[PDB]
Amino acid sequence: SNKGAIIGLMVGGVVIA
Amino acid sequence: SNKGAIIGLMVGGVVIA
Amino acid sequence: SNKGAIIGLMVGGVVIA
Amino acid sequence: SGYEVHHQKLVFFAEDVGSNKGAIIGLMVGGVVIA
Amino acid sequence: SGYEVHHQKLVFFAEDVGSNKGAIIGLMVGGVVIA
Amino acid sequence: SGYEVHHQKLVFFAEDVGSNKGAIIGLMVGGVVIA
Amino acid sequence: SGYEVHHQKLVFFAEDVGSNKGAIIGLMVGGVVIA
Amino acid sequence: SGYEVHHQKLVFFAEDVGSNKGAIIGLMVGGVVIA
Amino acid sequence: SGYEVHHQKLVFFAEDVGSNKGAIIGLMVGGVVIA
Amino acid sequence: SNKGAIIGLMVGGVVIA
Amino acid sequence: SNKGAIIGLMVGGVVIA
Amino acid sequence: SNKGAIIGLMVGGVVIA
Amino acid sequence: GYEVHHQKLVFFA
Amino acid sequence: GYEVHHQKLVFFA
Amino acid sequence: GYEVHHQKLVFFA
Amino acid sequence: GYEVHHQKLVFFA
Amino acid sequence: GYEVHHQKLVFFA
Amino acid sequence: GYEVHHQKLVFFA
């Protein structure tokens, strides 16, 4: 049940959803 | 049940979903 | 039940799903 | 004279004391991260 | 004179004390990460 | 004179104390990672 | 349409950045110590 | 459409970045110590 | 459409980056020590 | 130049000097 | 130059000097 | 130059000097 | 004199 | 004098 | 004097 | 149009 | 258009 | 268009 991103901890980076 | 990304911990990097 | 990526820990790298 | 140190402890812990169950922990003591 | 140190501990822990079950842990003590 | 150190511990642990069951652990003490 | 992410970093570090030289470090993530 | 990710990094480190020279490190991720 | 990921890194490290020279390291990931 | 104890980090224990 | 104890960090324990 | 103990990190234990 | 120091934990369930 | 120091843990279940 | 120090753990289940 | 993005670090010593 | 992105590090010593 | 991305590190000593 997710079309996108679910991040717990993010340091920098690139996420395209 | 996921069309995207589910990241626990991310340091840099590129994720395209 | 996953069309995408499920990462526990990511340091750099490229994931295209 | 004469030093005398008495110590006595009875400890009882229940199910999950001080636990990190299901936790997401990012920790850093020094070092460098260039993301 | 005479030093005298007495110590006495009775410890009882239940199911999962101090555990990291199902945890995601990223740890760093020094070092370099160029991501 | 005369030193005298007495120590006495009775320890009882239940099912999984201090365990890392099912954990994801990334650890680094020094070193270099060029990702 | 069309996504476009540009990123550009120039980094310069001098002698000892983020270092633990001569440090005393005691670290604990979960676990049990009965001293 | 069309995704496009450009990334570009130039990194320069001097003598001892992120180092643990001469450090005393005691580390624990889970586990049990009965001292 | 069409994905396109470009990546480009130039890295330069000096004498001893991320090193553990002369360090005393005691490490534990799980396990049991009955001292 | 020390008649005694010099401790950096101490968790429990007994030191007699 | 010390007859006694010099502790940086102490958690419990016994030091007699 | 030491009559005693010089401990960096101590977890339990007994040191008599 | 005599020094005596104890402790009990009676845990019914 | 005599120094005596004990401890009990009676755990029924 | 005589120094005596014990401990018990009676665990029924 | 044309997108141009650079950077310089001239470090004399 | 044309996209151009560079970087220089001239380090004399 | 043409995409060009470079980088230089001229290190004299």
From Swiss-Prot, chains M, N, O, P, Q, R:
Subcellular location per the Swiss-Prot or TrEMBL entry: Cell surface
Record: residues binding Zn(2+) 2: 2, 5-6
Domain of life: Eukaryota
Name this protein carries in UniProt: Amyloid-beta protein 40
Subunit field text: Interacts with S100A9.
Site (Cleavage): 8-9, 11-12
Annotated binding of Cu(2+) 2, by residue: 2, 5-6
Parent-record interval covered: 680 to 692 of 770
Glycosylation: residue positions: 2
Biological source species: Homo sapiens (Human)
